Design an enzyme around this catalytic site. Sequence first.
Site, mmCIF file in Angstrom:
data_model
loop_
_atom_site.group_PDB
_atom_site.id
_atom_site.type_symbol
_atom_site.label_atom_id
_atom_site.label_comp_id
_atom_site.label_asym_id
_atom_site.label_seq_id
_atom_site.Cartn_x
_atom_site.Cartn_y
_atom_site.Cartn_z
ATOM 1 N N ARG A 46 9.924 31.122 46.297
ATOM 2 C CA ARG A 46 11.216 31.094 46.982
ATOM 3 C C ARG A 46 11.747 32.512 47.243
ATOM 4 O O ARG A 46 12.116 32.860 48.371
ATOM 5 C CB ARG A 46 12.226 30.273 46.171
ATOM 6 C CG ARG A 46 11.748 28.860 45.840
ATOM 7 C CD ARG A 46 12.895 27.936 45.428
ATOM 8 N NE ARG A 46 12.823 27.569 44.014
ATOM 9 C CZ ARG A 46 12.662 26.329 43.571
ATOM 10 N NH1 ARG A 46 12.548 25.323 44.426
ATOM 11 N NH2 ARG A 46 12.625 26.098 42.268
ATOM 12 N N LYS A 179 -13.449 30.504 26.492
ATOM 13 C CA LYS A 179 -13.668 31.390 25.366
ATOM 14 C C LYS A 179 -15.147 31.483 25.018
ATOM 15 O O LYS A 179 -15.848 30.471 24.948
ATOM 16 C CB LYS A 179 -12.865 30.918 24.158
ATOM 17 C CG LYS A 179 -11.514 31.608 24.017
ATOM 18 C CD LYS A 179 -10.501 30.683 23.358
ATOM 19 C CE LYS A 179 -9.294 31.446 22.817
ATOM 20 N NZ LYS A 179 -8.404 31.991 23.877
ATOM 21 N N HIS A 237 -6.910 21.865 23.209
ATOM 22 C CA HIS A 237 -7.825 22.808 22.575
ATOM 23 C C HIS A 237 -8.706 22.222 21.487
ATOM 24 O O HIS A 237 -9.923 22.116 21.639
ATOM 25 C CB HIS A 237 -7.042 24.009 22.004
ATOM 26 C CG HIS A 237 -6.092 24.630 22.977
ATOM 27 N ND1 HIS A 237 -6.308 24.605 24.337
ATOM 28 C CD2 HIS A 237 -4.925 25.290 22.789
ATOM 29 C CE1 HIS A 237 -5.301 25.203 24.948
ATOM 30 N NE2 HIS A 237 -4.460 25.643 24.030
ATOM 31 N N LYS A 340 -6.590 32.568 13.595
ATOM 32 C CA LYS A 340 -7.945 32.065 13.476
ATOM 33 C C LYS A 340 -8.156 30.832 14.334
ATOM 34 O O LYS A 340 -7.334 29.913 14.339
ATOM 35 C CB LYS A 340 -8.251 31.720 12.013
ATOM 36 C CG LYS A 340 -9.704 31.361 11.736
ATOM 37 C CD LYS A 340 -10.100 31.735 10.326
ATOM 38 C CE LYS A 340 -10.023 30.528 9.410
ATOM 39 N NZ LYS A 340 -10.705 30.786 8.113
ATOM 40 N N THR A 376 -23.859 31.560 8.819
ATOM 41 C CA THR A 376 -24.301 30.467 7.966
ATOM 42 C C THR A 376 -24.101 30.784 6.509
ATOM 43 O O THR A 376 -24.754 31.662 5.945
ATOM 44 C CB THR A 376 -25.783 30.121 8.189
ATOM 45 O OG1 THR A 376 -26.499 31.294 8.585
ATOM 46 C CG2 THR A 376 -25.914 29.068 9.265
HETATM 47 O O1 LIG Z 1 -5.462 31.096 21.334
HETATM 48 P P1 LIG Z 1 -4.835 31.957 22.350
HETATM 49 O O2 LIG Z 1 -5.642 32.261 23.553
HETATM 50 O O3 LIG Z 1 -3.992 33.035 21.794
HETATM 51 O O4 LIG Z 1 -3.715 31.012 23.025
HETATM 52 C C1 LIG Z 1 -2.935 30.181 22.148
HETATM 53 C C2 LIG Z 1 -1.809 29.509 22.904
HETATM 54 O O5 LIG Z 1 -2.382 28.497 23.763
HETATM 55 C C3 LIG Z 1 -1.392 27.812 24.542
HETATM 56 O O6 LIG Z 1 -2.010 26.857 25.324
HETATM 57 C C4 LIG Z 1 -0.379 27.142 23.653
HETATM 58 O O7 LIG Z 1 0.585 26.483 24.447
HETATM 59 C C5 LIG Z 1 0.287 28.196 22.795
HETATM 60 O O8 LIG Z 1 1.260 27.588 21.953
HETATM 61 C C6 LIG Z 1 -0.800 28.867 21.963
HETATM 62 O O9 LIG Z 1 -0.226 29.858 21.131
#
Ligand SMILES: O=P(O)(O)OC[C@H]1O[C@@H](O)[C@H](O)[C@@H](O)[C@@H]1O
Lengths: 479, 479, 479, 479
Positions: A46, A179, A237, A340, A376
């Site tokens: 916009r 990743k 994820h 992690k 491992t």
């Molecule tokens: O693991 P990365 O790449 O840092 O991304 C994590 C993020 O991934 C996003 O999809 C989530 O909505 C966030 O809450 C999360 O922190």
Amino acid sequence: VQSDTHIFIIMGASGDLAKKKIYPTIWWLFRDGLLPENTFIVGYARSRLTVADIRKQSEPFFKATPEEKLKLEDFFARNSYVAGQYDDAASYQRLNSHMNALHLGSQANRLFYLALPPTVYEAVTKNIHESCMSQIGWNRIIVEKPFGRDLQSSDRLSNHISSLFREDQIYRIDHYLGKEMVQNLMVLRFANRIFGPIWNRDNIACVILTFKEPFGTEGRGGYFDEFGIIRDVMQNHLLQMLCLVAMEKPASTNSDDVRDEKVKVLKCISEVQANNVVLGQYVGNPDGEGEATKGYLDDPTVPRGSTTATFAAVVLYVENERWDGVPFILRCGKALNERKAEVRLQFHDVAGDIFHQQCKRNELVIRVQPNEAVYTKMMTKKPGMFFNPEESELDLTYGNRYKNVKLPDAYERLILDVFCGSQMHFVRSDELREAWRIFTPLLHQIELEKPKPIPYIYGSRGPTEADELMKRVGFQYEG
Amino acid sequence: VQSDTHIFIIMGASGDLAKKKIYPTIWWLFRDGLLPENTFIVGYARSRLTVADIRKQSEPFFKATPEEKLKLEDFFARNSYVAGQYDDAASYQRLNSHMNALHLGSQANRLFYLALPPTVYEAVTKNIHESCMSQIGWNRIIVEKPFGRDLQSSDRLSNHISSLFREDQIYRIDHYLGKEMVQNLMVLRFANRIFGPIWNRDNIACVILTFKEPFGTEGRGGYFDEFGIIRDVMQNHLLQMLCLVAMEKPASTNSDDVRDEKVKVLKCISEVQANNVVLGQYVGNPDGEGEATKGYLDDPTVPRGSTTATFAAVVLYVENERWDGVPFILRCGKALNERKAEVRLQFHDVAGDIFHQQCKRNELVIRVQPNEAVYTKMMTKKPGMFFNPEESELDLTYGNRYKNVKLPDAYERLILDVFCGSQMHFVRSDELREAWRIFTPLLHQIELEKPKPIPYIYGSRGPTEADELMKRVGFQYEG
Amino acid sequence: VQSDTHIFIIMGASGDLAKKKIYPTIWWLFRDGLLPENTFIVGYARSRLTVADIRKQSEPFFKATPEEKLKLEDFFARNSYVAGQYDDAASYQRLNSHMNALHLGSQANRLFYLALPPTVYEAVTKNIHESCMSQIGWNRIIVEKPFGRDLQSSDRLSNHISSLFREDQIYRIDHYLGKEMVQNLMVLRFANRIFGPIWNRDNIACVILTFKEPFGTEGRGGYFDEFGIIRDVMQNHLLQMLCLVAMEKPASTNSDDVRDEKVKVLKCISEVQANNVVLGQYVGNPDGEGEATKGYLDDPTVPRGSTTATFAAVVLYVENERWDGVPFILRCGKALNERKAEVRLQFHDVAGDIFHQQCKRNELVIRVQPNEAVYTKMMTKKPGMFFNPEESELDLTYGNRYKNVKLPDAYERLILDVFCGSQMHFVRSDELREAWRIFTPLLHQIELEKPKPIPYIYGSRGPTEADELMKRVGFQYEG
Amino acid sequence: VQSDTHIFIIMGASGDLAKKKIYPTIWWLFRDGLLPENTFIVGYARSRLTVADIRKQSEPFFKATPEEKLKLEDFFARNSYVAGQYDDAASYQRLNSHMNALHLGSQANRLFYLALPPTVYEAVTKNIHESCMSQIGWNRIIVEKPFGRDLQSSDRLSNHISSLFREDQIYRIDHYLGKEMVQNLMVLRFANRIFGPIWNRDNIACVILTFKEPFGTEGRGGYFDEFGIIRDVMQNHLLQMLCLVAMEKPASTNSDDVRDEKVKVLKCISEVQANNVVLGQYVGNPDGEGEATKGYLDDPTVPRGSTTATFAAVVLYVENERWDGVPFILRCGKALNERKAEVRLQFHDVAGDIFHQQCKRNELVIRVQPNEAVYTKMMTKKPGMFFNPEESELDLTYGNRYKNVKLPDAYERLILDVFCGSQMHFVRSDELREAWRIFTPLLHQIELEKPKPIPYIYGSRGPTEADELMKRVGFQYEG
Ligand SMILES: O=P(O)(O)OC[C@H]1O[C@@H](O)[C@H](O)[C@@H](O)[C@@H]1O
Ligand SMILES: O=P(O)(O)OC[C@H]1O[C@@H](O)[C@H](O)[C@@H](O)[C@@H]1O
Ligand SMILES: O=P(O)(O)OC[C@H]1O[C@@H](O)[C@H](O)[C@@H](O)[C@@H]1O
Ligand SMILES: O=P(O)(O)OC[C@H]1O[C@@H](O)[C@H](O)[C@@H](O)[C@@H]1O
């Protein structure tokens, strides 16, 4: 290796996601000479802006070296901005005219990056479909989360979009699929023998998919609250990771041969019982520093009296010959002790013990991040003048073995994949369906009853109760 | 015990092995404080000497530092000598009284280390049984190689010795059994699940046991010319490693529970056949370094027209449920391109290749030396913006992981065992019998038919016919 | 196919075991021309008898056809009787003289059948060893149960006998090892592939070794009482079966290669817990006929107030990689509903059910008797115009497939085996040791506490409580 | 439903297949009371006839008994005819109204069974879509073979038909899919554990799919001369059985969950190659029976110099984790020594032979016909006084076990399915496509190169070169 002209359309360019992820990411690919030569970038929003403006607000984000001045000049020379409205059809017609005017804009392949809110999705896809579509080249839409909240809310959009566009045109993003190590699960598993005979209920005691962040909602609990963590990191994820770990071998590495097998796995998964679930919420840390002493409810953006979880421990189950009975533990959370993202296969104990309980369960660990690695955990004879067993490990660390090799951001490789027509790392329709089928019932329940989430101190590992859901399910910790 | 008085009788104390290995070894065990407090070292030989001489001829092998000038006095202060002949009972009655004169001599534990030629083995054991034996403590006799030239030859020796001593008194030596990685085999496979189900004919394409030395017969090929490479390194060393790699899981980590599993494996190894053997004899490298310019025959200590093998490659087969069909390659040679001793398992190719032949066979490698390590060569996705599979490996290298730690000598640990009463790592009668039953028929064919070994250049890898033999049986090599 | 002269000595000829089992059995073998030609039969007992007498009392037991008159005349022509005392040495010297007088009695192989009470065993073996032994031919002793009651009582005899005789001379009888299907377990298991991949904890839910008799102690509870059922059928029969079912594959079908593996299995077995045990005792049946209305305590020979079991359900456990965790259910008893001796492997349920719980656990059944058979219980599509699964079976019935083929009595084949020097089907020393090691603790306990056995009506399947020990341990019944 | 009115339109009702198979079949289903109450049978053809004629020409195929003279009236009372051409819309508008005149005709469910030549397939489907279709009920079209001569040919047909009808409307037929044992494959493997872990490359040496007929081209080899044996029996029948034997366990017993697993297997079957094929053409047996004295070419209906194969033996390979490497032998022939249709799996030899080569490979056999049965050829100890292993088998023969039961015709059951709406046992579009992709390249080579089939005597087993081909790939035959 393409000659075809290209148009990369960033819908919602004045946005923060486009200004800090999308623009910079496409710059990285232009610079590294990863994009087709004839590639144009068009930003749409916009706000009435110039390419001078888009650059001024984005350049602080390109992480650019003064030696790239020329390449930057060349990049923005290939950039344009079209001010328009999101639910207006004339604004969209202009966008189209603009594209056709670009050199060979008529035959160019159009790649539409939906850097907007989901509240907008429909209007935009409906409008692009009518006006903004090529007729000689291909057209592809890059979508992102959230893809609904409920199974009904998602099927609602899935179908809207599915009616104007085919699946070979839809590219839905789950950045974790971009990743390195997540992508590596396939080769590790299917290109290696040493990891075949052991990949089953016969050998594996349990599986753990871990998500951890040291910080929590950062003065942004508002957006989060209506989301929870499950819907945030679990349904997407963590689950995707699970697939790649549980799925059977595909006929090929082919985009939709691979995806079938992912769905196949999600379909062997029965619904999450609120008995195998463990939610948590982060209270502050009186003995900490900065944001660390702030709980989640200590956020004004945070509704007054929330039962919203910032930590979830869940046990899923893949009901088939390979995993029949093996508990899949998805443990995700914010405000934890560390950063992690990892996959862990704890193997069973050895039958007939000649070492007197001196041995510890073997383990295959794939650390998505940080410190990319696949190692491992096993037993060795205590080095030196000893005969006893000792816990050691065989490792593959990208930091040592692959010192001077840059691992790309999920976006660079994921965006690049849309340029190649490789959907294998993008969520498919039926997949979302199955993901919602599992969690929907649980997510609903959490809304009717509105249970009180167990609290945990910022910087903790989470609610102890989850650890027990683990042992109870078959997890052993000592080591 | 660890309070008990011990006497360590070094028979043939003036010898080169005594003064170069046994003495220097016994002292380290001493200095590092591993020997029991009340231990006495009594040398027995012909050359009428003084503990003073003995110090001078072995002291340049002590690996000692000036900081330890006194400990050596502490050491040599527990040393004695007893000049005598090997078949005179007068000399032996002298050796006795001498030990009987030592503090608690009559009550002590006795260790007869035999550092003499195999001609004297017969006479000595007799006289030791005839005079120099204890009645209050234990008596163990350490016998070193060689244990005969043939099955019949060894039967003679073994039978004599066993006519006097029991098996819990006989300590037959193979130092490879005292090497770190070699000892780690037991725990590596039986202490881990990650290595259990792949350890069979179904997953293993072949096993390769390697032994190489960058050097040759350093000026002394007249001794070796009598024995040959097989008798020298294969029948013993290589064969022992195959036992540990091939054996079934024992009932316990007990000596004759482990030694039982070893013999059981040898019992199902059919005799070798010449059509599965490649023999080599090295020649000089004119474009050579120094000692390399000279081959076997270019030594006068080595008889003329010699057909003695300085290199051998033999394929064995363990006929059983587990290994039926899997080839065990035994490759041993002198004067090659390197010094290496390792165990390697090449696994089969994965079923249903979805990676287009780009895949290489996985391999578990246990490098005994140098650089003690165990690693698995596997396939990982080419790191970076690549999707193709690339060869990598997960390692457990001791030099890095256990920098600090000190890996002892095979004799330091082995000898220390004769002290605790552990025969695990000592060759039994049957074992030794089985090992000769396997190689004799072939050793004989070589003395009868007298084939001419394939020449190979000094520094090379040996005869290519060896590599061809490897292929034919299943060995798959990169390039 | 032997020329050697033979002497078969039946110690305790006037006995009932010799008169109704031993004599007739050796007649069957003489008749069928299974014995060496030059074979003599000598009966030895206190009673001053003639070969006229032995025949008169035995012939009623030979099941002889009038067409065998001549063969009978020939058999008894080769028979003799020596009256003597059991603990007297002159009586035994006569026995010897008698044998030497037989044609070539001096060089003949002597086979001593100990058809006496165990109360006599020692006296007889000690006396035979001194006098009655050949010096040119082999000498062998056929022994039988009981081999003690305790582990101490047995080791007591094992050692006495073991001191005069070697193991290659001792032949201990477990008649079940002479049974067709029991003997078949080896070929079934080790000659077939279809029965390999499934023979493990991964596939087998549980194993059942069943012993059933429709009648009980028959006015002979006196002898029984001091015995119980465990010591009677479990510690021996049932256990042996278990071995053949759990043992690993031997290096050969060789006598002592096979036996090692049996011991190997018994050694992986931990002691019977009184929690996994279920004893029972048979009360009478008021609604029955004859002996059927008589309980066990309704026997005058039966001590007044017995806690002696006539039924035992026990769960054993083989602690090794193959059976680690698989419950072995030994269910034995008298006064039950039928006569059955069988082995049963109930396999696990199939993973991922597309038939809706319509399927029943697979099962491998080896019926020792009656109706010799090995059959596989499984699922088939309901024959005809149906699509559902149905329980059916694949069978091998000796009654149909092998209609006109006579299966021999255990004694005929077992006696014949002693003539051949085949010990594979005879209990070994170390075996008895291990059998006692497991049950001794339990059998003792039953004596100190003297628990009250659960009662069960004559003609019943036993105490219901045992069935639950089954389900609890992992057994499913429906079908 | 089971209350709904149905119309069964038999297109080409005067044909031989109609009058010899379809009519007689439809009536049995009728008599046995399997058809739904309100079912009408409408014949459509050219030859202007009366239900009276139709009765006379099909009634000697009814397999009817005098006891059922009335049911036939009940039957023919639901019969009608509609004379017409196959590409005249006037005739079709007639067929309609006719059904519309039937009770509830406009509301009925319609079954178009096509008993016409494949030339008319095109035209008819069209006109059926153009006129004779229902709007209230369901419409299903039963298409029978042949489904084209080549992949391109079939693509034409499939595409036309699918241009008009959906897959849930198309019922492609392969009667073998309606045969008892063939249908039992699904349940045999997926309903049992006893058959699960042996069902793979690790345990199976090879798979043999057999089809034989003791007869040949009974006076009509002009029809077949156009098609050949492969097109006739292999591409369809044999290939379907391989699908069922080779396929992975489906997600459910649902049509397109099963059909998915079928296509998935075909998708990984590479195209056949001539160096893996043996073709035969039969000749007469002079020392012959009757019709046997005449071979293929001894028929004038059969063109001259014909090189058409009356027998084929083809080796296929399913490239996947499960079957990679295992050969699938497809042996089909006419004029042989017997009439048999069976599936057979020859397992590998056991590892470590302790029975001295006396052992034969195990075999799971599923005889589709005749004498429907499934059995396992295994090794058992030679029954009696023998210890050696002998070949036997565990059987499930239907003739004995299910004497009583009546196994229906493939068409009786198949047709009944079109009524319930089950496509499980009907060939899908992709499947059919995959099946042609495999055989086409070879079929073409045969029409191009025109190799001369190996002659084989009538009654023989076919060309020995077929047996040689079998050996070379792994088939082990007794003798
Ligand atoms: O693991 P990365 O790449 O840092 O991304 C994590 C993020 O991934 C996003 O999809 C989530 O909505 C966030 O809450 C999360 O922190
Ligand atoms: O590997 P290590 O310990 O050096 O041992 C090597 C030596 O081992 C000995 O046993 C051989 O006789 C020598 O010829 C060989 O060189
Ligand atoms: O099973 P079979 O051969 O009938 O023999 C069973 C008998 O075997 C004997 O050993 C037992 O002492 C008896 O109590 C038992 O009845
Ligand atoms: O085995 P069945 O049902 O008799 O089927 C055999 C017939 O099947 C047909 O499909 C073939 O075209 C014929 O040639 C063959 O004879």
